[PDB]
């Protein structure tokens, strides 16, 4: 990982990149933040019983 | 003449959004890599 050219070199495992189109990796879209929507329960479970 | 060109991702298909599962996939080596080369060849032949 330096420039998209070098990524092709490790992809091909060769220092010579021939003319053409070569698939390097995927495109990952990371989530913005973790969202949590749960029901509201303030009661403790009867573990004593 | 031609068939649907399909490119399968064997990194995401096997392990969804998983780091631990991914490390386990590395133990199996280049198998994932070989699949892309095989399907890539198919897609190229469809244009020929």
Swiss-Prot record, chain A:
Glycans are attached at residues 32, 34, 40. Changing residue 48 to H: In strain: Omicron/BA.2.75, Omicron/XBB.1.5, Omicron/EG.5.1. Changing residue 48 to D: In strain: Omicron/BA.1, Omicron/BA.2, Omicron/BA.2.12.1, Omicron/BA.4, Omicron/BA.5, Omicron/BQ.1.1. Residues 28-44 are annotated as: Disordered. Binds to host ACE2. RBD also interacts with the N-linked glycan on 'Asn-90' of ACE2. Cleavage of S generates a polybasic C-terminal sequence on S1 that binds to host Neuropilin-1 (NRP1) and Neuropilin-2 (NRP2) receptors. Interacts with host integrin alpha-5/beta-1 (ITGA5:ITGB1) and with ACE2 in complex with integrin alpha-5/beta-1 (ITGA5:ITGB1). May interact via cytoplasmic c-terminus with M protein. May interact (via N-terminus) with host bilirubin and biliverdin, thereby preventing antibody binding to the SARS-CoV-2 spike NTD via an allosteric mechanism. Attaches the virion to the cell membrane by interacting with host receptor, initiating the infection. The major receptor is host ACE2. When S2/S2' has been cleaved, binding to the receptor triggers direct fusion at the cell membrane. When S2/S2' has not been cleaved, binding to the receptor results in internalization of the virus by endocytosis using host TFRC and GRM2 and leading to fusion of the virion membrane with the host endosomal membrane. Alternatively, may use NRP1/NRP2 and integrin as entry receptors. This is Spike protein S1. The lineage of its organism: Viruses, Riboviria, Orthornavirae, Pisuviricota, Pisoniviricetes. The chain holds residues 292 to 340 of 1273 of the full protein.
